[PDB]
Nucleic acid binder design. Structure first.
Lengths: 97, 229, 146, 98, 53, 229
RNA sequence: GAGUCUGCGGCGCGCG
């Protein structure tokens, strides 16, 4: 928010609306300035986010952050198996690949 | 005009370089800053056309997972760095431009080392392509194209030279878009919107140029409501 | 012949060649029957061209699923250096294939705490949750799983 | 840190010295006791489970290295630290049904 | 106080009433004191199956 | 045209009466149905200009919470029913029109009982205002205006007569908007948008008419980005 | 006017 203040702009209609719904929720002490309010809400670990599809905010602060997440090993179990027709067992006559 | 029409969105602009560009527009009726700002944002990221490294060919390298002697970085790390190269051509006649570069020995290969091309410009000079030790022989030909969106190297599969390796296409000249709608005062009624959207660009195109293209794609789509059926 | 391009080196597949499912990685030819030729296959051969190579195609192909680029290849022929070739085994042929696994919908990712899950949809940066400043989020986790 | 070190991922510098050559295949350092060793780097090797094992040099040419400093990073190390998967920005909210 | 059903949700969209707020609304034959949201749900079901009553 | 231009949004229309109107438009690139649908929605409810009951004055009633003898309905139920009245004036000269009506005795008061005004028309005839019993004296003056969006009776506070009671302004002739973006298949790439937006109207204007006005307000706003400063 | 032959029992681990 500090660079936001210097870069030249303040709070959105969006940013204020979510704040209303937010104080009505119990996340921000009613009576404080949105600047001070957003801080209190950020400290909560939650910030204001716009839908991206509609550009309208998502009523209610939502947490966001840097979560370390790993990709898991794709076995030959992943690479899906779909079988039409094919091999068959020598003694039992059931399908096998 | 004087009354309702002179009272028109004051389009103000503040742009430094070709990367950042703030755009203020006020006054607006009720909840319009949001009605305009989001669509323009959704366009500004998905729709704007640009440039990206389409294919590469190292002279002695055959596959993407190889390593070149006298070169720290691996083919993969290098083709990766290439996707970071931002080029900017000046006219339609340049659909596919092949940049050529060859450097040897104890030198660091930066993007300014590419032999200049008449109608193409490289605003990503100091980008680090590789570190050459000794007897470091690196001669490559990196293709460049103009497109839109994201194209997996798998989707296009470019083959200038039979042993060249295709690279992932990154065509959005914009990294991020931001808009704010702050209340503005018009003598009579205090409930008003003011939309200021800040756009960032890799340099290929400018914030203003992007914004304009954006508004056009939206207008072009608004006309598609013409013939009922 | 269209299936024999990549197979440039006589037999072996060339290095740096994109192998898709169902392409020939390595060729090989064995014999058609168990012990006898075929009475009905004898007439077909003779009609269009009797002189048809009796040898059968038993070539290492790309198994359904995926292959990538061929990066390395190994072939152990007759005069073995210091290798142990099994009996019957005339010679062996290893073909190392590599492929970049971009994250797709099938793949599964999970954080060190325990939240496990698979990717359901790859959204365009265009409309996914974005912050006041243009920076959009990368992944959106479902609260209910906590 | 410890995991990559006690495991044999990254390649560490034996004693103090300087760097001679930084290849994508080998890093021959010159230690201050007057010796110089060529450290090959498993370029691209096939793991049992089919994963890539490459050692990516993190040291530039002619660099005084401290004893026990990473010269090359293991298959999954950033900077001598253990690293699997990546740090991504994430919003913890529900979407349609995705 | 909202006359028609729709009337209630438009005010919502315009920021006058949250969905979880307690208002009065005129339905088919009654003046019911129920929140917009509750009225919205009523609609979704009533729509799913056309036999509204 | 044949290739990319003939492949143009097939604007299809399905409208019954002047109240409902479905509007389908496909194919669309990636995430455009949403980029178009939401702005149109935000316009369709606030921008479209109309007419709503601004104030009312029952002769013997002083407050909004009173009841008139010989009249079943309460002042509040009646002023409620008035918000339901849809009037349509023909020209700018009619900014504020006061409709007058007075009925007595054993009669049902419908909206057609209002004395006709030269340039104003009432498309909501049979709307039920009240049920008068015996000795039922009902003389009122209901104001009507042209505006945009929703204005709480608290925001404007109209005072023709000192004892009159303002009423909530319901200016949009459009009750509800709805849009869906379902996936559509175009031979080559499955990832496509299909935008179908359903609009409901009180009858004053039609769904198609509203949609066109909407796209215009957006277009007119897209031109406000002309002169930099 | 194509069809043979191989992949079993067990063991270990991992997912659900």
């Amino acid at each position: 928010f500090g660079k936001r203040k210097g870069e030249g702009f303040g709070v959105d209609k969006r940013e204020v609306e979510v704040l209303r719904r937010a104080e009505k929720l119990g996340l921000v002490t009613p009576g404080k300035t949105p600047e001070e309010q957003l801080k209190e809400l950020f400290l909560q670990g939650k910030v204001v986010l716009y839908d991206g599809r509609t550009g309208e905010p998502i009523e209610g602060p939502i947490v966001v952050g840097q979560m370390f997440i790993m990709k898991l090993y794709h076995m030959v179990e992943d690479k899906m198996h779909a079988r039409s027709t094919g091999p068959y067992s020598l003694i039992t006559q059931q399908p096998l690949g | 005009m004087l009354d309702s029409k002179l009272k028109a969105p004051v389009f103000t602009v503040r742009t430094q370089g070709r990367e950042y560009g703030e755009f203020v527009l006020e006054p607006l009726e009720r909840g319009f800053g949001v009605t305009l700002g989001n669509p323009l944002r959704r366009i500004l990221l998905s729709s704007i056309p640009g440039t990206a490294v389409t294919s590469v060919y190292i002279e002695d390298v055959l596959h993407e997972f190889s390593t070149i002697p006298g070169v720290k970085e691996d083919v993969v790390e290098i083709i990766l760095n290439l996707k970071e190269l931002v080029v900017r051509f000046l006219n339609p006649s340049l659909q596919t431009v092949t940049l050529l570069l060859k450097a040897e020995g104890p030198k660091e290969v930066k993007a300014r080392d590419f032999l200049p091309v008449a109608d193409v410009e490289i605003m990503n000079p100091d980008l680090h392509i590789a570190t050459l030790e000794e007897g470091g022989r690196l001669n490559m030909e990196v293709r460049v194209d103009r497109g839109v969106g994201y194209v997996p190297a798998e989707k296009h599969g470019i083959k200038d030279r039979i042993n060249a390796i295709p690279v992932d296409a990154v065509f959005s000249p914009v990294r991020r878009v931001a808009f704010q709608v702050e209340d503005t005062r018009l003598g009579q009624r205090t409930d008003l919107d003011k939309l200021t959207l800040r756009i960032w660009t890799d340099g290929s195109v400018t914030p203003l140029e992007a914004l304009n293209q954006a508004v056009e794609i939206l207008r072009e789509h608004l006309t598609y409501f013409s013939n009922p059926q | 012949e269209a299936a024999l391009r990549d197979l440039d080196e006589e037999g072996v597949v060339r290095i740096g060649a994109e192998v898709k499912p169902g392409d020939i990685l390595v060729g090989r030819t064995s014999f058609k029957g168990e012990s006898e030729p075929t009475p009905e296959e004898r007439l077909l051969r003779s009609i269009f061209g009797e002189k048809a190579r009796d040898v059968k195609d038993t070539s290492l192909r790309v198994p359904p699923g995926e292959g990538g680029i061929v990066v390395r290849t190994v072939r152990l022929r007759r005069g073995d250096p210091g290798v142990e070739l099994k009996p019957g085994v005339r010679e062996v042929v290893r073909v190392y294939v590599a492929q970049k696994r971009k994250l797709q919908v099938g793949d599964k990712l999970a954080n060190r705490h325990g939240n496990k899950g698979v990717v359901a949809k790859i959204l365009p940066v265009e409309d996914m949750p974005h912050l006041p400043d243009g920076t959009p989020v990368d992944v959106i986790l479902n609260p209910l799983g906590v | 840190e410890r995991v990559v070190r006690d495991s044999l991922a990254a390649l560490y510098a034996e004693e103090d010295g300087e760097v001679a050559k930084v290849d994508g295949n080998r890093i021959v350092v010159r230690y201050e006791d007057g010796r110089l060793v060529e450290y090959p780097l498993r370029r691209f090797y096939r793991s049992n489970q089919g994963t890539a094992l490459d050692q990516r040099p993190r040291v530039v040419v002619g660099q005084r290295v401290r004893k026990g400093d990473l010269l090359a990073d293991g298959p999954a190390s950033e900077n001598g630290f253990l690293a699997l998967g990546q740090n991504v920005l994430v919003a913890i909210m529900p979407f349609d049904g995705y | 106080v909202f006359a028609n059903p729709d009337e209630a949700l438009l005010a919502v969209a315009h920021g006058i009433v949250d969905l979880q707020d307690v208002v009065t609304v005129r339905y088919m034959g009654k003046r019911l004191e129920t929140s917009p949201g509750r009225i919205l749900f009523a609609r979704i079901v009533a729509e799913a199956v056309e036999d509204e009553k």
